[PDB]
Amino acid sequence: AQANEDIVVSKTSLWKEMQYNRDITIRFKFASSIVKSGGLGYKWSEISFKPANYQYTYTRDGEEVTAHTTCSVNGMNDFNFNGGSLPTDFVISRYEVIKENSYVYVDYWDDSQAFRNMVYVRSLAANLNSVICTGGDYSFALPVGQWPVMTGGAVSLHSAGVTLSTQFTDFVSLNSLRFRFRLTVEEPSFSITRTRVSRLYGLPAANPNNGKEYYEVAGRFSLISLVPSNDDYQTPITNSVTVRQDL
Amino acid sequence: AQANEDIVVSKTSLWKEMQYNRDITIRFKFASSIVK
Amino acid sequence: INLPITGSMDTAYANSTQEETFLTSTLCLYYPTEAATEINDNSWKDTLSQLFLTKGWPTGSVYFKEYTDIASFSVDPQLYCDYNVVLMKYDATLQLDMSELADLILNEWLCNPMDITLYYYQQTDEANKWISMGSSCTIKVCPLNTQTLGIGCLTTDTATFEEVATAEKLVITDVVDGVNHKLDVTTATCTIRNCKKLGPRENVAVIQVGGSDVLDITADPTTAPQTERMMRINWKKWWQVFYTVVDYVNQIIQAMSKRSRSLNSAAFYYRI
Amino acid sequence: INLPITGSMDTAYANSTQEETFLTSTLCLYYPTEAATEINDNSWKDTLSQLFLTKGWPTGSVYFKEYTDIASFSVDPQLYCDYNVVLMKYDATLQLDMSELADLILNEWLCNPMDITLYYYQQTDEANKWISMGSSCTIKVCPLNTQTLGIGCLTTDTATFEEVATAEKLVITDVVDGVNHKLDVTTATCTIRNCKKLGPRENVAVIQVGGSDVLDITADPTTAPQTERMMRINWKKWWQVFYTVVDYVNQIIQAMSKRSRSLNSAAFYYRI
Amino acid sequence: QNYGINLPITGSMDTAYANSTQEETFLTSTLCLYYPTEAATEINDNSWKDTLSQLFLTKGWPTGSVYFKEYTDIASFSVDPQLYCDYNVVLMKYDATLQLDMSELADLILNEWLCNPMDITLYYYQQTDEANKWISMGSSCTIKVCPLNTQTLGIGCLTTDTATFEEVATAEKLVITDVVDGVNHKLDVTTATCTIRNCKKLGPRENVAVIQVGGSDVLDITADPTTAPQTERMMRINWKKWWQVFYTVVDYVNQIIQAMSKRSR
Ligand SMILES: *[C@@H]1O[C@H](CO)[C@@H](O)[C@H](O)[C@H]1NC(C)=O
Ligand SMILES: *[C@@H]1O[C@H](CO)[C@@H](O)[C@H](O)[C@H]1NC(C)=O
Ligand SMILES: *[C@@H]1O[C@H](CO)[C@@H](O)[C@H](O)[C@H]1NC(C)=O
Ligand SMILES: [Ca+2]
Ligand SMILES: [Ca+2]
Ligand SMILES: [Ca+2]
Ligand SMILES: [Ca+2]
Ligand SMILES: [Ca+2]
Ligand SMILES: [Ca+2]
Ligand SMILES: [Ca+2]
Ligand SMILES: [Ca+2]
Ligand SMILES: [Ca+2]
């Protein structure tokens, strides 16, 4: 059997249950939100995660396949560090870290036949390989004085259950495949330099990518979806959003 | 006839028309936006 | 030929085709480097030819082909003659390798190529196998389920694959027939071919120079046969080996029989 | 049953009982810890079960039983299944041990206990042997003449006795039949039993994973047989061995036959 | 001499009644008592075995035919009973806190089981007929079971959370578990200390004989709560000593071994 098969397990007049068994190259990326409080510049408000889209185009076995991936995090732990109540001490009201109790969600979508009209899916399962996400170096640009740098943090992402999801964006809406990942804390720890904090496991939410373009992980997925028998039907993908007009 | 029934008023090769008659307890809530 | 043959039990036994099959056939020996090393002579080939001349084989009919090692010979062997004899040194650290060599040369294989990237293959019957040749073959396999995912292995994480070979020059692999396997091979250094085992090759004759009979051609564990052209010797030198072969070459070639399938210089037919 | 059976040759060959014996029977492998180690996977049992499932053997019929050493297994082997396979490594220094193991599990024994101190025993026929099990058995025996004296030994001096075992976990002792022997055994760690060899056990199949055929089941030095449920593989890995056993399990079970005597878990019957 | 085959045997009704096999089956067979430590404790003698054998001698059982094999308690004997003799007698004390233990022991020894192995971690089992049960032995067995539905999901239990499982056994040395026939059950067992085996009950074992030394008949061998039988080799006694019990066993050993018949297997 080919690595990119497509089979029919049932076919009525208009509909048909099509099986798909395909290899994929999930290239995703974190994205951090940094909100700095006012005053002098010695107090930071939040250092958190933001769901991050990343669209790429990779090469299949003699085919070019465009994709769209979206990384998110759930159940992260909220730490904080306050060394003084005065406007001249370095303080971080709330920053996020990832540990065992958290999960990493990755929605995936391609331009292939599997995701053309996918709204119904059963017999879902996947074989994913594990990777290692390492944090980078974020230099807190204080107004004057020293420059603490949050540096380090490593954590291994291991395959977990799979589900469906919907990637919403200002351009496209995608009925997508949701891969979950659990976390096992690794040896490289993250520490704020020139500060009384160090040797605490997890990943920092300031520079998770470590100056990388993405995190790559290869996988295979196998499902059975409902596709109209005629291979000409199309489900709306693009969007034109005007939500949060009150905002 | 039950309160939370589930009936099949038709059935084709793949799809099916099902009827659902169920009781519910809508526990809803408002939320206000203040701006100063 | 689909047609039948007929005969009779009253006809007479013809004269000996020996002393003519010799003339109109060629003989080829496959000796290890160790032999010429222990000998330290530069005319032993002409000597053995002059000896064969008494047994009937003319001057330009015998040939000798060195092979540094069993595995270096197992790497794409090429037997292109009319009567091949192989002298094979015994070593318990090479038993399966010099049994796979036997399984390859004594038998006649019909081989198709394999594209691991684009396809996932399976063995149909108990005669289909996967034979892989090259300088260092590391073969791993993940069996698959009805929905093309892994069984005790991850279809992507090659560490979770199941290792059937570790840096081997010639591997003959049989897996559970009826399931699809995803393979990982050192394709840069080794080529793998899906080969079916046809009727045997009666042109060659293996001679285990040392230990007891261990070659199990049949991959099934029940048979463990000993064919007629799988001989054994006990040795302490090599000149005695070669003199014994020359003295009992008639029995060897009576145990061997010319081929019927086709003319081919490799150890396996190719049919794409 | 004592009655006779009758039949014919016109009666027809009934269908294959394979594909129903697989459903109504159990299969049990006995593998070494070396195999689990070389595999280094915690799902290979489920893998092999899912594989067997294609050969017809259902899920809950295949079983795997780890045995750390040939000797540790030889210490009271407990086979309780309908079809037992044993994978046995080859070691010259363990030749007689893995031969006695074969001699014990392949054949069916009827055993009475032995009270060395109170009584003095002898062997009657060429199948009445003395099998001793335990963690470290060191056995010595003194033959006795017609008038209950020693021959080359003294009834009191345990050092004059003739040693036949030296810290062996399983020993099968055959002494001269017709004379009474006084024994000395490390009874604290070992139990010895006077056993009679009955017809063979057709439920078990030994598979020598390594070297040449060495097993001499029969104690007499004239037969040197090789039965049908006694196989030989040549190996460099273990996944190949298991894939082979799976792909050729039907030949194995065709070489084996369910028992006739009775239901028993031990390798030998007890009758006091 | 055909083994493994079952053939019709014929007979008549005018043949004469052959001689007695008693007084010869004794000489060519062995007997084995299984007495508790309490009895030797009460006795406080080191020659009572020789005494009983010299007494047996008068009933025809020679010296090297009778054997005594001691056990400390009912459950310690329940752990892998090895009854390997031509005739087996088992003296058994009565205690309301052990009724099920000494019913399971009876069910196990009086009957001849065909036991296949079990691998909990991989497989999920079911009982097919009313004779298929799961017998677990060991020093401390603690068994929990979850029935499953048609689509391999739980019924009042979660396949992962072992706590949700239903406890049928709690630190028992011998358990004979019968569950509903037709539903695949997932198990959790203290496999470090206990071994569990899927056993089909065949015809009975006529080679053993249980003798309840105290209270009334309680043994519900048959799992089905309808039969509640009482076989011929399920005896009862009233006791205030143990020497009287042993003298009685001796003096009536002939009826005991007439109630016991050597095995078929
Ligand atoms: C076969 O051998 C015999 C005996 O030497 C000889 O007479 C005969 O001529 C031979 N056949 C032919 C065709 O020469
Ligand atoms: C016996 O085998 C033949 C050939 O496969 C088949 O047609 C027939 O139905 C079988 N009968 C039984 C009773 O299995
Ligand atoms: C059977 O019993 C009768 C009466 O005691 C006796 O005469 C006869 O000899 C016995 N049979 C044999 C074979 O001894
Ligand atoms: Ca090899
Ligand atoms: Ca694996
Ligand atoms: Ca095969
Ligand atoms: Ca031994
Ligand atoms: Ca001596
Ligand atoms: Ca003997
Ligand atoms: Ca109990
Ligand atoms: Ca519950
Ligand atoms: Ca039941």
Residue numbers in the entry:
A (entry chain 2): 248 to 494
B (entry chain 1): 248 to 283
C (entry chain i), D (entry chain g): 55 to 326
E (entry chain k): 51 to 315
Could you share sentences copied from the article?
Rotaviruses infect cells by delivering into the cytosol a transcriptionally active inner capsid particle (a "double-layer particle": DLP). VP4, activated by proteolytic cleavage into VP8* and VP5*, is the principal membrane-interacting partner; VP7, held together by Ca2+ ions at its trimer interfaces, is a Ca2+-sensitive “clamp” that anchors VP4 onto the underlying DLP. Accompanying or following the engulfment step is a large-scale conformational rearrangement of the projecting VP4 trimer (cleaved to VP8* and VP5*) from an asymmetric, “upright” conformation to a threefold symmetric, “reversed” conformation. A major consequence of the reversal is projection outward of the ~250 amino-acid residue “foot” segment of the VP5* polypeptide chain.
Local resolution estimates for classes 5 and 6 showed a well-resolved, virion-bound VP5* β-barrel trimer with its central coiled-coil domain and a poorly resolved lipid bilayer. The side with a well-defined profile faces the nearest fivefold axis. The coiled-coil at the C-terminal end of the VP5* β-barrel domains extends just to the inner lipid headgroup layer, and diffuse density extends beyond it into the bilayer profile, but peeling away of the bilayer leaves nearly all the engaged spikes at the periphery of the contact, and the resolution leaves uncertain the molecular features of the likely membrane-penetrating elements. Two of the three tips contact the liposome bilayer, while its curvature from flattening has probably eliminated a contact from the third. The reconstruction shows that the central coiled-coil domain protrudes into the lipid bilayer, although flattening and distortion of the liposomes have prevented us from resolving protein structure within the bilayer.
